Ligand binder design. Structure first.
Ligand SMILES: Nc1nc2c(ncn2[C@@H]2O[C@H](COP(=O)(O)OP(=O)(O)O[C@H]3O[C@H](CO)[C@@H](O)[C@H](O)[C@@H]3O)[C@@H](O)[C@H]2O)c(=O)[nH]1
Ligand SMILES: Nc1nc2c(ncn2[C@@H]2O[C@H](COP(=O)(O)OP(=O)(O)O[C@H]3O[C@H](CO)[C@@H](O)[C@H](O)[C@@H]3O)[C@@H](O)[C@H]2O)c(=O)[nH]1
Ligand SMILES: [Mg+2]
Ligand SMILES: [Mg+2]
Ligand code: NA
Lengths: 187, 187
């Protein structure tokens, strides 16, 4: 995978809703040897996720909704607990995530803290994910956050044992709770 | 709660599989609502962080990832915790084999953290997460080609730094590094 990446072919395998490409690239080695590779690349655009936490109560806000992709893959009920999250669409990550937060969780969020931007599945998915945390309070609650999306308010400690047992099993939701833990913000 | 799969359509089956799934969802009323969702299925995998308590080092890898190349990773090169796809193998057999091919270590004992969905929007993938201690006495070769992957050993203080500089920017690697920290085995 060293150096010299010549792009050779970008074929669209499927462009219904999101896009599936087949990508042909060449890697050229130290000696000048050229090896051809072919890789499916699925482009659903980038996303952002936020973790709402509160230091007055030691609580965090998450959601739960039906994820069909997990229903077809081992998740019996299909419902999944997760940090609030949205696709970028036409929006910068901040705008994206503020709106996402107020549609899904019904909180008007103020100061945010960006953590990192991570690829979640870099083998075959372009998806970059913008991570945020922000503190919440009862003042910031505009509405209810309704889709089958249920808003969960629970102890930070509870959420942590749910990672332990399997009740929480989403990746971006685990990163975020683990970062809040290591941040000390909740102590 | 009540879920019925109506139609599973194959949009692409060139190598991996892209499905367009129609399902009925019964609401908090008894209300039936129909959805269509693209679901990409590349199977599942397993990833392993290798750590040495004596040297306080970790082992990670650097390879080219086309999925990131087309979405913001200039050189396409990406640092990740060793991983492989399941290929009908059990997570532990998989990751044991992944470790020798990619890192050159026949790791002895192995610990299982959890299984997480990495991108539950439209990707099926479930990753099995691992850690295990390593030593030179476990090495045999220096990374082969199942590929030409590069093997980075580095100070575990540096790896954490790189997550903050965004030099490390892969979902499964951050988790792995973050969990190890929280676990304290490195103090
Ligand atoms: N027909 C159709 N509609 C879709 C599809 N995917 C999304 N939609 C529409 O878009 C909505 C989803 O909006 P978001 O809240 O932005 O999507 P999300 O699933 O929460 O996405 C976030 O989390 C994912 C899981 O990690 C991330 O992968 C993603 O980037 C994003 O951050 C759905 O209610 C639906 O109307 C699809 O495959 N087919
Ligand atoms: N033609 C073709 N071949 C492929 C494709 N994807 C993989 N292969 C073949 O399978 C090999 C992949 O090596 P693995 O170590 O088994 O998988 P990985 O690419 O490291 O994937 C791991 O990381 C991904 C990203 O986090 C994970 O999504 C995946 O589950 C796995 O754990 C490649 O060298 C290649 O020969 C594809 O889209 N097309
Ligand atoms: Mg959402
Ligand atoms: Mg690999
Ligand atoms: Na496209």
């Amino acid at each position: 995978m060293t150096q010299q990446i010549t792009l050779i072919k970008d074929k669209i395998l499927s462009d219904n809703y999101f896009t599936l490409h087949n990508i042909t690239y060449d890697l050229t080695r130290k000696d000048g040897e050229v090896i051809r590779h072919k890789r499916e690349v699925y482009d659903r655009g980038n996303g952002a996720t936020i973790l709402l936490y509160n230091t007055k109560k030691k609580t965090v806000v998450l959601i739960r909704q039906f994820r069909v992709a997990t229903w077809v893959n081992g998740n019996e009920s299909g419902q999944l607990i997760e940090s609030c999250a949205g696709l970028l669409d036409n929006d910068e990550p901040e705008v994206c995530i503020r709106k996402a937060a107020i549609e899904e969780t019904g909180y008007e969020v103020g100061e945010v803290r960006k953590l990192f931007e991570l690829y979640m599945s870099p083998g075959g998915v372009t998806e970059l994910i913008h991570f945020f945390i922000a503190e919440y309070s009862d003042n910031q609650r505009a509405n209810a956050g309704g889709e089958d999306i249920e808003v969960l308010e629970l102890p930070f400690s509870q959420a942590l044992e749910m990672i332990k047992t399997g009740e929480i099993r989403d990746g971006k939701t685990v990163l975020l709770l683990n970062y809040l833990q290591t941040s000390h913000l909740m102590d």
